[PDB]
Amino acid sequence: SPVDAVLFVGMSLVLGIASRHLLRGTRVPYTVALLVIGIALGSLEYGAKHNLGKIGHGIRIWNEIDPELLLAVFLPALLFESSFSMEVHQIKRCLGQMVLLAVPGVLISTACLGSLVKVTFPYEWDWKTSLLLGGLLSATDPVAVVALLKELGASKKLSTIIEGESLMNDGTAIVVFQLFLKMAMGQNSDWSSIIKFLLKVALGAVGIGLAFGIASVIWLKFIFNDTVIEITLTIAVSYFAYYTAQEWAGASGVLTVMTLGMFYAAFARTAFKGDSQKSLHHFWEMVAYIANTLIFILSGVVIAEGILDSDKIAYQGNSWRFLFLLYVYIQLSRVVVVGVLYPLLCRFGYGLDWKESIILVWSGLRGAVALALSLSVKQSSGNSHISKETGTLFLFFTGGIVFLTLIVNGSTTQFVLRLLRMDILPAPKKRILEYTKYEMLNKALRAFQDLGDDEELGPADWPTVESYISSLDPKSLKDIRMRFLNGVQATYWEMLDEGRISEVTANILMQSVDEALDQVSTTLCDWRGLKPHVNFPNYYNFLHSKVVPRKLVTYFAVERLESACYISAAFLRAHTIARQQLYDFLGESNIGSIVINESEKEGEEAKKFLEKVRSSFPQVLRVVKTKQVTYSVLNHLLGYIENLEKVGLLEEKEIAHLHDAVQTGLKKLLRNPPIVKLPKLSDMITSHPLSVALPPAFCEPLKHSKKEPMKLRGVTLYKEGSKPTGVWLIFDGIVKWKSKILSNNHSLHPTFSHGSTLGLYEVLTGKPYLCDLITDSMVLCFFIDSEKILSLQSDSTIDDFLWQESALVLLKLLRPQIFESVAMQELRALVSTESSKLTTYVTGESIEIDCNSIGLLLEGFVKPVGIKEELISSPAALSPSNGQYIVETRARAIIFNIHRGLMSWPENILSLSERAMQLSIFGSMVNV
Amino acid sequence: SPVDAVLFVGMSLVLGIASRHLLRGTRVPYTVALLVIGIALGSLEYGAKHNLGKIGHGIRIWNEIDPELLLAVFLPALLFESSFSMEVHQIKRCLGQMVLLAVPGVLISTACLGSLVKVTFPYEWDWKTSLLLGGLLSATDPVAVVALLKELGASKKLSTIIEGESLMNDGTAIVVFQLFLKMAMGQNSDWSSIIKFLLKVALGAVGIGLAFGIASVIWLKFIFNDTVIEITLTIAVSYFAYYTAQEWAGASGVLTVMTLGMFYAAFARTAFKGDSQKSLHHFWEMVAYIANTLIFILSGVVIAEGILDSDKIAYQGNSWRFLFLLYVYIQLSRVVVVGVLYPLLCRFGYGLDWKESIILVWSGLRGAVALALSLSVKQSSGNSHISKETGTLFLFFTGGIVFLTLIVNGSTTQFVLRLLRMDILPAPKKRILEYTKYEMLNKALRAFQDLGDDEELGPADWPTVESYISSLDPKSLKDIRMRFLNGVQATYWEMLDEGRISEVTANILMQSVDEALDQVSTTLCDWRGLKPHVNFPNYYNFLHSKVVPRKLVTYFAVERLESACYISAAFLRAHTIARQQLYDFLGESNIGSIVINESEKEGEEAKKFLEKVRSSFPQVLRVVKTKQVTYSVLNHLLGYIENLEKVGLLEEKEIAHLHDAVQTGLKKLLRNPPIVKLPKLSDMITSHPLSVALPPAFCEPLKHSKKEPMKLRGVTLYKEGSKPTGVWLIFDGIVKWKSKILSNNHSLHPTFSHGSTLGLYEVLTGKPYLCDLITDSMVLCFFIDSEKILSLQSDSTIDDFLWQESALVLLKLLRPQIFESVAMQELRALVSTESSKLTTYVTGESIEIDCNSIGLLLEGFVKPVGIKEELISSPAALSPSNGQYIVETRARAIIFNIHRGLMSWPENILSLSERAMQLSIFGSMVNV
């Protein structure tokens, strides 16, 4: 007999596999087909008394399945992954509406449904059992709703809203179902009894789940490099959570497993390995899928057994009337609960409209959970409390509700989508889709360009490759804003590809910009999407209560402000790059200036947040940047190691050691944020690039003490035209430069970065201060007198290096049209190149600027050739006027050699030789 | 009571997880720790009579586990993935030694061990039960051996040899164990009875497994895009294979599941999805891991129960003597079987030496399979045939053998490795390792270069990042050969990265070159590694037996020659590129010429194989190239789609549709090779680049009939100095050009490719044929008379295009020093660039060649300036002599603008500004 049960399980599994395979994108889920097949099989086994053999034995051995055993085997398996694959950031974005739809939504739904099925539902029912029915089919199938919504059209709001509300409705409905099913078996008599029972079954289960989750997350953080033990540990901890919950504490094990899934979705994304997460999700999806198909087949067969029993419930000819009435009651209950919650749903979280309201009310899919609970009721029934017809009627009613609710509410929802103007794709997103379907074509064409150079295998055939990929202004403010926001999206994509931010941060930023793209007509609301993720409420940690450890403060501050810090940094860099790109694209359009000013003013509270973080926690910024840098570095190393393992180029021991080392580094990162000692002033002096010219004797004036590096926001450094009293050093912070005399035109983002010396040009030339410096953020800055640098000017090499640094700063100043749109990173390479040479020019000589090169005069006067004689002053930024410049005074100079298509997609894209190219590579005629 | 069993399962699982986590790289497997813990728990439950509570109930409910149930639950779970993760190409490389070690190796081991444990092993035993013991602990644990060997030092031979021999020893041992355990329960009496029983249990099980594998592979090929249903289908088909095998046909279900795993490892790599394979492997590893830990714990607890029973077997004080004798017998049996098989092992497959012999004999690890079979014996025992002590003694003996065999043979094997000079890493592989640990450093440094440009988060801290990555000639023939082979490895790596070949082909080529690197002293044996994978035995298909379908011939030919065709193509391209790179690296070394000649002569039988394929099947080459091209294109598109899904940049419906389309294309590819119609001559004419100049009236001389395009190998095209009788067209094939008059120096690989016109220069200039053409392979070539082209010369645009193509060919001829090391792909871009212009020069004018540009004279005479007056003839290839050329006759010309470090790793790798750079980016002092 045990072999019969496993044979039934395997047969049901094969039927599930077949039904899912045949019914992909057929506007009908495989689950309803499984239910119908199970009903047919049960009818053939019981209704017709046809001896099915061993399959019949399996049917009759699973017909007597214990209720509690059914819950234990199935319900946690259904609910673990449904609560595991959550995008917890989106949930925390709209958690208020989630709980509002979950707890009081289910309460109201159960109350209304029980009242309706008690007043007019003639079977001489009881109020407790009717409310039990309400709480039974007040549960929404999460996986079916997720699949429907992915097939359905919902940008990001309805998807997560309905997903989470169904997920939490499962738990709330199972809790209320347990409460109502436990009617008067020696307990649950008075109001205090049910209150304490709820307290236990809910809070104790949640606490057990959270404790087990914490223990397992610590274990995972302590597990360095192994995929399999992670899935196995998840299985073991889930089983022990269920065991402790229901056989040690008496709580609800299913709710404990569901809370465990919540905790793993929330605080265990970084605990799991980078490559093990996909496999773990696939395996738990597989467990949930087997559980779902098996519970559906079992429900179908038990319904068929029940409705065609000796009493012949189905052949009464009247039960279907009340089944249709119950479906109407489901619809009415959903309508009334959505209407009641609408006055509060709209004011919290995501804005909900009547369109979203009707999509929400119509997208109620009672599936596996309701069927499992109904099977639980139609088992161990027939006693004094729950009778026998009073049992099947529940099972047949719930099965018919699942049938109708998955056929009509699963099919006609798309037809409703066709109305109400939601299936239409907005132009801001249509541009994105058509661009991404245009990069597919270009990437494929470049690949076919590359795979045509070889000659041993002969030409390729373009038509088949094309067949296999056959699935392929300036005066308008809104278009300019949309182009700017698309540029911001491209910048986020590029910075994620290069590795500024992890996957979750990029997802948050892209979701926010997608939300902001819908309000392109009005002011840019990009930062409004990021507002929930950037919070700096209080700093009670600095009230001396916890600064005594002076190390846990850094840990807590990082763990709380870490994601917000990446979000703000990426936001600022994206808007800077996008502003520069838009300025290049438009040049001098007034609309361009308006939108740039709009973006600059809009991205101000993020700067305020970063300034507050810097002023409160000076060391959190360095730790956060270190964590980001090492995370990106380790991801690159992991990619290289995966490539090597694919090749097999190294032995399976050295490559295993390297992979283990990289995984250990990643786990030590995601476990504890990097510990960086607070740098002293001398450490920053040594780390500063200018310290090479600074002798070690000058490196220890009591290790450069007696001065505090910090400078508050807005503190001036030196006024324009003032005497060069000294030169500053910028170890960390922001300095803004302004000057009317200098050609500050097209200087969109005037800013010097860390590791720079400022004012060196004036102190080594004696000229008045060219630029006015204002510190936009708190800057860790140091001052060194003019006399020290003038003394350092004694030797030739030090003087040459000092004038090289002066030249770099003077390129940053004089020519922001080209060199402002680049960090101080590459300019050091340009100045350090041996081709770039410092030269001294005598009167009568000239400057040999030519093609593919640029020049810079530092001191002296130059006479141009071919133009009216001009006395070009010391800061010149000499450039080839044609694609000359004789010297007239004592002069010394220096010479140098000199995804981003989404902003302008349709505005950034024949000769007899081109056609020859096209034929020699492609087929007859296909544009490249 | 059922809850007790599941509690025991969960406790054992947690203990397994803990033991594996603690004992990673401790030179002791977690399995022995699990065995010891199980023995201790059983001793505490039975030996001390200490009431353990519910854990004790679980122990006593699993103590009475049914034997057949134990096999069913455990053994297929152990063996499915052990037979699933095979690298089947390496197995087919050395299958002869595999079967030799498996079938007769196990037979000899069982015979010798049974004889030894029957002659001197006093318990009044029987011969059948003693041979049963031999066949029981004649099984080697596959997973433990794999883990040990990955920790152990074996390049590629011992690893796969021992892995496969243990894997097949499992099946052979379970078959012989079933045969010996089935002694005289109403069957297996005479020799005919055992012969037919073996025939059934082996061949019928293999056939059932193969049929189920074929059905499931067809199902997988018909499944387009879904990960979960693939794992679920694997589970379902495995269960149904076991069911059909043992409860419908009477065969051995475990052997059927093992053969199913073989079939999936062999012919189902392409059936599974590209992203689902890793998850599926992880899940089945997880199932095998739970099965292994549970069987180990169960074996330990049952041993503890048995040896401390009423009879007190352990406390007899003598059983350990015979246990140690049995361990010595295991060692002696392994020694004798390896010695017997050595005269035949060495002559077949991989060469096996005494060093490999001792590593093989010492690496025998009896693990989970032997313990499971021994538990099967110590259950349903105590009857007339198998007694009761005669049962435990088997269980305690097998458990002690596993204990000793996993402690000493699992630890001292590394110490033996320390001797015999195998742990030493050879210099050819040490160079590879130190290079790959040098690209880690460069990639990390470049990443830190990129992640230092931003300014909102401030500087990064280099020391912590460094801490997290703290795990980091010309006259010698052998060094030159090693450098050349490293260049070939780099070429394979680059061509896999760009996508010439799949992962398996790149793995085969890299394994072959790794094997060849060990014989660097002698002639290059690279092709010897590829020899088993390149076979063209017979072409009976062309005997008119199966050419009537004239479509199944292409299918069968592709399916048989497909991998060999990629291997040969990649081999040829890799050696061409490596020869060119080596010639660039050395220039004119005699050793370089010797090794280049060696490589060219060595890579000749691959050309012969490709020529045979082309002559037999003309259309297989195009189909194979098409399949490769579309596979690479779809992989690139899948990578882009995965990037987009990570971003979340598109809605979850359009991106889902694109992913589904790409997966459907990939499945339609891997299911059926692409169907390409055989191109007609007119199709190739139109597809040829020169057809643009050919008018449509000239495009249909009865669609260019009356001529057969094919030309055999070695057929000349036109002799040097002959009159330009016409111009040829190369649609597909190889042409070699030789000319003493032309500067053929440094022309390492003189070859024109497909889609080219040859001889056009001479026919449009009237000069004698510059080059001598020899067809190195069968070429599909066409001839067009001189009069037609001279007539086409009538119009200006056609003449300009014709002279542009002439210029491209003449760059391919005159300057092979620069333009031979590039395909005809990019040269079309160079000639087609608008900067590259065709100009007509009158006598007295000059050619304006300058920096960053090149020139070409086609007809006329030119006088140089600054050098003795030379009459440079019509083919000139004018180049800037300094980094001039006045015209003297009627002349017309044309102007143009103009992983690979592994070959030379240690010979391809400060100023005051450089130190400033280093400080401004990094910490104090770290070389870049």
mmCIF file of C-alpha atoms in Angstrom, chain B residues 11 55 122 238 291 299 355 387 411 427 434 506 615 702 758 787 789 819 859 897 916:
data_model
loop_
_atom_site.group_PDB
_atom_site.id
_atom_site.type_symbol
_atom_site.label_atom_id
_atom_site.label_comp_id
_atom_site.label_asym_id
_atom_site.label_seq_id
_atom_site.Cartn_x
_atom_site.Cartn_y
_atom_site.Cartn_z
ATOM 1 C CA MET B 11 18.405 16.208 13.712
ATOM 2 C CA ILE B 55 14.966 11.353 19.794
ATOM 3 C CA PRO B 122 36.353 -18.025 11.456
ATOM 4 C CA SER B 238 13.548 9.156 -12.150
ATOM 5 C CA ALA B 291 20.809 11.018 1.485
ATOM 6 C CA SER B 299 24.481 3.308 9.715
ATOM 7 C CA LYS B 355 52.922 6.634 -9.619
ATOM 8 C CA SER B 387 21.651 -15.540 10.454
ATOM 9 C CA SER B 411 44.331 11.655 5.252
ATOM 10 C CA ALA B 427 56.743 25.392 -14.589
ATOM 11 C CA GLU B 434 51.148 33.176 -11.689
ATOM 12 C CA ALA B 506 36.752 25.117 -25.162
ATOM 13 C CA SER B 615 34.279 16.882 -50.300
ATOM 14 C CA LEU B 702 20.228 31.658 -67.262
ATOM 15 C CA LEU B 758 40.908 37.912 -57.287
ATOM 16 C CA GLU B 787 35.602 41.789 -71.618
ATOM 17 C CA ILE B 789 34.684 43.816 -66.561
ATOM 18 C CA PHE B 819 47.365 43.774 -43.182
ATOM 19 C CA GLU B 859 48.961 52.591 -62.083
ATOM 20 C CA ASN B 897 44.012 56.392 -42.933
ATOM 21 C CA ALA B 916 51.761 61.844 -7.239
#
